[PDB]
Amino acid sequence: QQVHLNQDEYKYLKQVEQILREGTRRDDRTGTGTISIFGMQSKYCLRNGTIPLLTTKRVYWKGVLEELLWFISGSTDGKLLMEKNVKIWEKNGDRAFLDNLGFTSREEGDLGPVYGFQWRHFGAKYVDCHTDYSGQGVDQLAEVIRQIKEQPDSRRIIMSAWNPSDLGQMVLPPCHTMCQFYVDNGELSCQLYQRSGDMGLGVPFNLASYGLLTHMIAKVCGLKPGTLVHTLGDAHVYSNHVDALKIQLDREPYAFPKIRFTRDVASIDDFTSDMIALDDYKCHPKIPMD
Amino acid sequence: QQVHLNQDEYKYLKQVEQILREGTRRDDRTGTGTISIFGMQSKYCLRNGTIPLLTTKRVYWKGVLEELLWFISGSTDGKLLMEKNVKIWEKNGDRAFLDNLGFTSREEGDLGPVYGFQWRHFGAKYVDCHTDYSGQGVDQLAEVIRQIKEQPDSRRIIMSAWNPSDLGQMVLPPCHTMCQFYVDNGELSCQLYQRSGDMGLGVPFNLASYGLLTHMIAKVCGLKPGTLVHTLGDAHVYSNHVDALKIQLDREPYAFPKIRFTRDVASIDDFTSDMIALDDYKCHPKIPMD
Ligand SMILES: O=c1ccn([C@H]2C[C@H](O)[C@@H](COP(=O)(O)O)O2)c(=O)[nH]1
Numbered sequence: 001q002q003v004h005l006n007q008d009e010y011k012y013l014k015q016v017e018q019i020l021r022e023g024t025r026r027d028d029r030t031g032t033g034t035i036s037i038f039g040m041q042s043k044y045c046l047r048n049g050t051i052p053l054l055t056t057k058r059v060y061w062k063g064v065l066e067e068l069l070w071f072i073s074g075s076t077d078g079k080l081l082m083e084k085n086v087k088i089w090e091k092n093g094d095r096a097f098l099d100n101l102g103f104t105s106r107e108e109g110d111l112g113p114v115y116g117f118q119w120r121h122f123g124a125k126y127v128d129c130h131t132d133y134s135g136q137g138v139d140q141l142a143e144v145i146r147q148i149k150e151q152p153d154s155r156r157i158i159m160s161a162w163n164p165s166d167l168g169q170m171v172l173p174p175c176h177t178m179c180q181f182y183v184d185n186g187e188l189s190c191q192l193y194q195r196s197g198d199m200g201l202g203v204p205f206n207l208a209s210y211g212l213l214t215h216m217i218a219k220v221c222g223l224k225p226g227t228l229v230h231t232l233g234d235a236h237v238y239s240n241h242v243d244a245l246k247i248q249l250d251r252e253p254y255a256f257p258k259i260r261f262t263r264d265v266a267s268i269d270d271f272t273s274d275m276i277a278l279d280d281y282k283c284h285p286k287i288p289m290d
Numbered sequence: 291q292q293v294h295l296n297q298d299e300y301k302y303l304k305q306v307e308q309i310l311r312e313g314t315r316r317d318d319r320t321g322t323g324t325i326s327i328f329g330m331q332s333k334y335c336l337r338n339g340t341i342p343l344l345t346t347k348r349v350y351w352k353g354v355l356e357e358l359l360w361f362i363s364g365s366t367d368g369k370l371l372m373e374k375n376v377k378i379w380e381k382n383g384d385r386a387f388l389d390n391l392g393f394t395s396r397e398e399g400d401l402g403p404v405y406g407f408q409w410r411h412f413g414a415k416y417v418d419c420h421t422d423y424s425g426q427g428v429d430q431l432a433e434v435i436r437q438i439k440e441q442p443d444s445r446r447i448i449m450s451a452w453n454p455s456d457l458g459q460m461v462l463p464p465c466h467t468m469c470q471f472y473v474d475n476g477e478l479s480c481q482l483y484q485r486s487g488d489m490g491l492g493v494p495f496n497l498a499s500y501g502l503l504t505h506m507i508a509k510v511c512g513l514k515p516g517t518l519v520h521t522l523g524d525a526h527v528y529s530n531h532v533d534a535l536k537i538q539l540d541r542e543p544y545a546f547p548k549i550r551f552t553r554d555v556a557s558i559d560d561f562t563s564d565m566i567a568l569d570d571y572k573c574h575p576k577i578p579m580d
């Protein structure tokens with residue numbers, strides 16, 4: 001029967017199996033095939049410092065970590081993240097990518113009013129990735145933190161990246177579109193709504209990212225981490241990735257690693273990559289992709 | 291048994307039951323006790339005209355229908371609904387309610403930049419509930435319809451009411467915060483993200499509302515209805531509703547009613563209450579409590 005060291009990662013694999021077994025076979029934005037279920041939900045225990053970094057296929061932790069800190073900082077400048085040696089946004093801000101979208105006047109690495117800007121300045125008039133936006137638009141992350149501290153019973157602790165007014169100027173429309181927080185018996189929980197998820201790369205990354213976010217905010221608020229709830233619109237596997245995911249489905253998950261913060265923080269803006277430690281991230285062997 | 295005429299309503303009852311059994315006890319913003327689960331999801335088939343109006347406890351159909359048409363019209367004037375003998379917004383737009391929020395210059399019924407305003411003019415400058423907003427802000431509903439018709443493969447078909455810039459001026463923050471649409475083999479599906487849901491009174495109403503909207507857009511787009519995915523943040527039952535819900539839980543659901551449109555429509559703005567028929571809405575008798 002179903003006895004597993006890491007039940008939450010096992011359920012993830014079950015999620016992937018269900019997509020491949022019941023999913024619809026459609027052609028997507030690029031003309032490639034996906035196998036897809038619309039509407040899925042899964043839950044991940046964050047208690048005792050557990051962060052859900054998948055063990056059956058390695059997730060780029062360094063990238064997760066630096067992108068999150070960068071999001072939080074409000075930055076929309078791809079070059080700042082490249083300075084931290086993370087290159088996941090590089091191809092979305094280069095001359096060719098920008099020009100193809102009509103952003104011929106824009107400087108390289110200026111990603112437009114993407115996540116960081118929305119999280120910290122929702123409603124402000126975007127100029128460029130070098131403008132000082134202090135006190136412009138709504139600082140959602142700050143409000144979420146005040147709400148958690150002052151009104152922990154609230155059912156309105158929401159942060160959203162989905163800004164229709166700004167979509168035309170973003171290099172990519174937001175994928176993790178919004179999240180909601182929830183305080184129960186001194187524990188902080190988070191639900192991510194992600195409109196679109198690739199189960200082979202994107203989803204594991206987003207999973208770790210919001211897991212880390214919940215850990216950070218919990219610390220800032222003097223709370224213990226709770227449950228991450230991950231909700232998907234179009235959950236899919238690319239049809240060229242099926243063999244690779246099948247190899248992943250065959251593995252018995254290891255225990256998730258643990259997150260550890262090595263100093264105190266004054267606020268959500270007071271973390272640095274050197275004081276966020278990840279203990280015992282053990283992964284199964286590499287899975288080659290195509 | 292394990293077999294039901296209406297498996298979808300049966301699953302909703304099981305949802306209520308899961309909350310009562312596994313939910314956490316909380317005292318909310320109102321003061322009354324809730325029993326709560328954070329993060330739930332359920333699916334409702336809409337194929338062949340089916341609309342999930344609950345049968346074990348009657349849903350206020352006239353309210354659902356008139357509110358939706360009013361939403362689509364972009365109106366934020368509560369008096370238009372009161373003109374049709376729908377009083378669900380009355381408490382929220384009267385003198386004392388407005389004054390308590392500091393909207394002391396507002397006429398009665400001026401709900402602020404609520405749903406309808408966000409749907410048709412996201413990012414526009416709110417003045418009052420009589421202002422003509424043509425060409426101001428993003429018409430999200432029209433874009434959704436454009437995307438469904440022209441890019442049915444899109445994983446980006448989103449409409450959101452969650453506007454941080456406008457929250458302070460709304461009489462209530464949006465409860466059904468955003469929805470995503472999905473086209474598969476000519477079948478239109480919709481996922482609602484609801485941040486907060488009263489299983490007893492709110493949720494059934496929200497289900498019927500988004501069910502109806504999905505049927506409407508499907509007709510506009512020459513498509514067929516698919517599935518409604520209902521996602522909840524704080525899924526709760528009010529502690530004083532417990533006994534009446536226990537009664538409801540032993541009822542065997544009847545078949546859902548079906549929706550039928552009795553003439554063609556030029557666009558999403560061309561529906562009227564008289565041409566939306568609801569066939570065979572058969573319910574169990576009223577509950578001995580409220
Ligand atoms: O944070 C992200 C960003 C992207 N993707 C995946 C989902 C889609 O396969 C693709 C984005 O394409 P659209 O959904 O925008 O078409 O990348 C994720 O899983 N997570």
Ligand SMILES: O=c1ccn([C@H]2C[C@H](O)[C@@H](COP(=O)(O)O)O2)c(=O)[nH]1
Nearest residue numbers: 155319465466486487488492493496
């Ligand atoms: O469309 C709605 C609006 C409200 N509610 C319920 C949920 C909560 O019980 C209450 C709103 O309170 P807050 O979640 O806003 O505190 O009404 C719904 O179920 N659906």
